[PDB]
Amino acid sequence: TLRAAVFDLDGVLALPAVFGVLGRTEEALALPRGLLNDAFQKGGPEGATTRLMKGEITLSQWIPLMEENCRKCSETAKVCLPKNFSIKEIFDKAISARKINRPMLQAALMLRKKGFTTAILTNTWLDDRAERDGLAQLMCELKMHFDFLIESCQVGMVKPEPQIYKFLLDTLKASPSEVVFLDDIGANLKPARDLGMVTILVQDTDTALKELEKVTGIQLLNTPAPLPTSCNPSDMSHGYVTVKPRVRLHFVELGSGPAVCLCHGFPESWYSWRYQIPALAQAGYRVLAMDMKGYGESSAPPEIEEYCMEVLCKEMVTFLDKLGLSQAVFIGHDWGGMLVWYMALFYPERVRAVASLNTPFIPANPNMSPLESIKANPVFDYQLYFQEPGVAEAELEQNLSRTFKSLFRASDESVLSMHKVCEAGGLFVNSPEEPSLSRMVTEEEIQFYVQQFKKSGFRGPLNWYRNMERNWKWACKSLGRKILIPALMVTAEKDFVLVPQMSQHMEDWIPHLKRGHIEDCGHWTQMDKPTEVNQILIKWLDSDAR
Amino acid sequence: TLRAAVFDLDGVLALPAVFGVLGRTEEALALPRGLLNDAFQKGGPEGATTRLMKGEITLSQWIPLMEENCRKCSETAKVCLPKNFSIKEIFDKAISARKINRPMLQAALMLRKKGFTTAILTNTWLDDRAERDGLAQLMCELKMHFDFLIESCQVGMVKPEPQIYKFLLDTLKASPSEVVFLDDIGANLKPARDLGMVTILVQDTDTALKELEKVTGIQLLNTPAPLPTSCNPSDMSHGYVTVKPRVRLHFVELGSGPAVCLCHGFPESWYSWRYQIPALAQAGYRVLAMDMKGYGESSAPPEIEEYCMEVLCKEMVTFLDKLGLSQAVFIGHDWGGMLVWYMALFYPERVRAVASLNTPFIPANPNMSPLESIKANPVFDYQLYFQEPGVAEAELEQNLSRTFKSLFRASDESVLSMHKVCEAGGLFVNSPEEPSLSRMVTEEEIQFYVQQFKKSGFRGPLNWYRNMERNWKWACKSLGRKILIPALMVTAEKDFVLVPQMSQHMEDWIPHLKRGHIEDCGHWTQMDKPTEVNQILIKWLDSDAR
Numbered sequence A, B: 001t002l003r004a005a006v007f008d009l010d011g012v013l014a015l016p017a018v019f020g021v022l023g024r025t026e027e028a029l030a031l032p033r034g035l036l037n038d039a040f041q042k043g044g045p046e047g048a049t050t051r052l053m054k055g056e057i058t059l060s061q062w063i064p065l066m067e068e069n070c071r072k073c074s075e076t077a078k079v080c081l082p083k084n085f086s087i088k089e090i091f092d093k094a095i096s097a098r099k100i101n102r103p104m105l106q107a108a109l110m111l112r113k114k115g116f117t118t119a120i121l122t123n124t125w126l127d128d129r130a131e132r133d134g135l136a137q138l139m140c141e142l143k144m145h146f147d148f149l150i151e152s153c154q155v156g157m158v159k160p161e162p163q164i165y166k167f168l169l170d171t172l173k174a175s176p177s178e179v180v181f182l183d184d185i186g187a188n189l190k191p192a193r194d195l196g197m198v199t200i201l202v203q204d205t206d207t208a209l210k211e212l213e214k215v216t217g218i219q220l221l222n223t224p225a226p227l228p229t230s231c232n233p234s235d236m237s238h239g240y241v242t243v244k245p246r247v248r249l250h251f252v253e254l255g256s257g258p259a260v261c262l263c264h265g266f267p268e269s270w271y272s273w274r275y276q277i278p279a280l281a282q283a284g285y286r287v288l289a290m291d292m293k294g295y296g297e298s299s300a301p302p303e304i305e306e307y308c309m310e311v312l313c314k315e316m317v318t319f320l321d322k323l324g325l326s327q328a329v330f331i332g333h334d335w336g337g338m339l340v341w342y343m344a345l346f347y348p349e350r351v352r353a354v355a356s357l358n359t360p361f362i363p364a365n366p367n368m369s370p371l372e373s374i375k376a377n378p379v380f381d382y383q384l385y386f387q388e389p390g391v392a393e394a395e396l397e398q399n400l401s402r403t404f405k406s407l408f409r410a411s412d413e414s415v416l417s418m419h420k421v422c423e424a425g426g427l428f429v430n431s432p433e434e435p436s437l438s439r440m441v442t443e444e445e446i447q448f449y450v451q452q453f454k455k456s457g458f459r460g461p462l463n464w465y466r467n468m469e470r471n472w473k474w475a476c477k478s479l480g481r482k483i484l485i486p487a488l489m490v491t492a493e494k495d496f497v498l499v500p501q502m503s504q505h506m507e508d509w510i511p512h513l514k515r516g517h518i519e520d521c522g523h524w525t526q527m528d529k530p531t532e533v534n535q536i537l538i539k540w541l542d543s544d545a546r
């Protein structure tokens, strides 16, 4: 029956509402009760406020008309307004006070997840105040979650006029009995009710969601903690920079503020950051989520030495040069983690701060060839498997879906053993033809990786492992240095390859190192525990990169 | 003979040099002359400074070693260092004092313009100080102008060691007698001279350029004012955002800081901003230079109504939404100028500030259909010529090179008359088959426009002119508003279509409007007078958008 849900902004999706400042201002200032509301509503359908709400005039032009209405109301109530009484002041403060009502947004999100069309229908204004950006940010953050935002001042109609409900219906392509409409103003619900819409009068949020749950039959209250917002690839800004004649890097870009470059691991994608990209943008940063060289829409030349760390890092510096960025924050996971540590040691002037998920910083041992070093740790045997060009490419390319479904697994889900892979003859020799789907991913998300990896396959990616000696010689150049820029290491309890204890000496090289640690988290940290990753990264960004 | 030129950084491309702070610090503080230089050079080839310069240790690790050397030197000279004597302090201050030496950079640029390979060869350090960004910015700004930057600390070798000169030669693919090398340190020139390079010992800049002019035979001093830096399309970051199913917008992006969206006119390109993009990025902004809808790499659907202002503006808001930008500064020229005024009137919450080149803001007349309004001004007759779909497309597409060479002309160069175009039968009916090249453009730059316009031709572009009635009805909705966000109008003396006097009433609608005016400037403002445009935009950005 019900197929659509419509939410007001003031007092429904955002709180405290702004007439709640008309009320509170009267109280705080000991003015005649309702005086500010009288001024606000003066002249009714043709008074200043309606002209505002219909987009006839801007907020800045309205402010002095409200001033005049206040003067008139207080003359007629035979009172004075206090010295320094300021309408601009009151509204600036009310409008910045007003925050997203998180439980109501989460109900709308959930109803949209079960197939509802959702909309915001609000009486609002053209905001040209000096501080208008605050409201622009709120509306951006809210509206991306809905099918439609209908604003009185853009459509030239206002609640409770009946035409705006007809316009709503026509936008929804729904009939009234398929629609629930929530508002904190009863006079605003009446015309929706007249048309036979389900309406809910919102006072406290919980009771409104109780009514909303009853009428839609979906669970909205007491529901588990939802995942952070993810990214839809076709809604992102896609960027492309040529770093040298045969090599272009692709990235996705979202947000404003200090540049934050995310560097994914093997065998992954920009999309491995999908849960971090919207949260970090929301947190005040300019995210650049790379396809690393070898992957996705970035170039993948065939030659092994195109993937040594020296070359990869120089190219990442060029990438900053061509975008006109003097620095970025570098945040890496897995191979990308190893890369950002080398960015910090070789190009500290270009790195505002550095963070790694899982990958520890371990200085090259100048007394042991990296082959031997690798051979001293049974868990790294898969790295020898990767050496011989073509062997791992053929196994990994043979069935892409099976490849990603086998790799991308939570720590409780039959993770592959990295155990005597060479001896066994391959990574999947002991895994099923058709693995089950991890709880971490959807079938759609697996097919995104499959489709990315059909462009270049696994050659470029595997080549990252094929420069052990060359990277060892380059790293030995840095053995006298310390990392003294702001630095964060995030360990994962159940990553059984990049174990938390392998990071234990990092303070000898990075004395002011900060740490986070995520429990019950396997190797695929960003999608295993996206919520915790986001909280640990934002907290460290705000204190150390800002 | 000479084919390459090599410049030192300290004391050659940037001034004051930093040993000049060792000297000045001794004087300011009344220490024994040369004491700070002794500390700095202590231990020679194996002392702390050389290890710094070779990339063995970072600047932050070196600071306390220099401290120790200072202590040792002052013990042996039987003196005390003052209380609060700080090496970090001295160097922070020296390194921010140091600016690009503009005449030396302009000589290097000019030699590169006449075919020299240019390089910077410098002894420098890995900079991990809290304030390292300042130096990162300087190096970015300088290095983009050269073929090679060779840094002692990246290559592990230092002037005056002879191996760094062999490495230089091998980088240049030149023999020593084809190379001139400039340095302010004589001991550094000696090995270049030993190999038979032309060397110049730089004390004052003018005398060094005098020597440089004599030896290369090119004029470097007293030369006219050069153009601002332009953009090479294949060195830019290219971005792409889908704003709706059939419509993607392309833009080029350079810089960090407040977002500044540049909107070009008819029939132009992002590339029309090529002189502004590097200067505005350099000035502290994040430039987004659009292909407007209809042009270049943006989508060009065929339908007329896809190009009405309402649709164009809504799409530009979506473009900000998808990039996660709550606002941008909008700067428009020509049609793009008209568009940004409507962004300011319909979406002031999304526009941080608005500026137009040439295009005035004129409110719709609700008592006169826009056809009649257009017919009341002989100079607008070309707009009627554009109405009939296919007529202007066939003339403009018929020979693209002739099209752009005829349009893009300085005010002194036989500009087309916009005079009775319909009567005449077309825009070019009275222009040559092969126009000469304007002084404003190169033949290469014309062929960039030609190549852009081969993708979609002139249909989409012309469609901007084909929604007169629809835009008039939308504009009438805004007749009660004023523009009260920060706003700049820039008039061009000799634009004979968008005349400066057509802007004369703008203050009635935009009471706090700021202005600039460019004399002896025709219609193609950004390439006619790029230097003046840049100065007027940066000055207004820094005061009003920041």
Ligand SMILES: C[C@@H]1CN=C(NCCc2ccccc2)S1
Pocket (backbone or CB within 6 Å): A266, A267, A334, A335, A338, A359, A382, A407, A497
């Ligand atoms: C610097 C270190 C190099 N190898 C790393 N982990 C790869 C994890 C992995 C993923 C998938 C299959 C096998 C292994 S990061």
Ligand SMILES: C[C@@H]1CN=C(NCCc2ccccc2)S1
Pocket (backbone or CB within 6 Å): B266, B267, B334, B335, B338, B359, B382, B407, B497
């Ligand atoms: C809003 C105004 C609409 N027409 C404008 N100028 C087009 C200039 C022009 C360029 C090339 C040929 C003819 C004319 S801006």
Ligand SMILES: [Mg+2]
Pocket (backbone or CB within 6 Å): A008, A009, A010, A011, A012, A017, A183, A184, A185
């Ligand atoms: Mg409300």
Ligand SMILES: [Mg+2]
Pocket (backbone or CB within 6 Å): B008, B009, B010, B011, B012, B017, B183, B184, B185
């Ligand atoms: Mg020097």
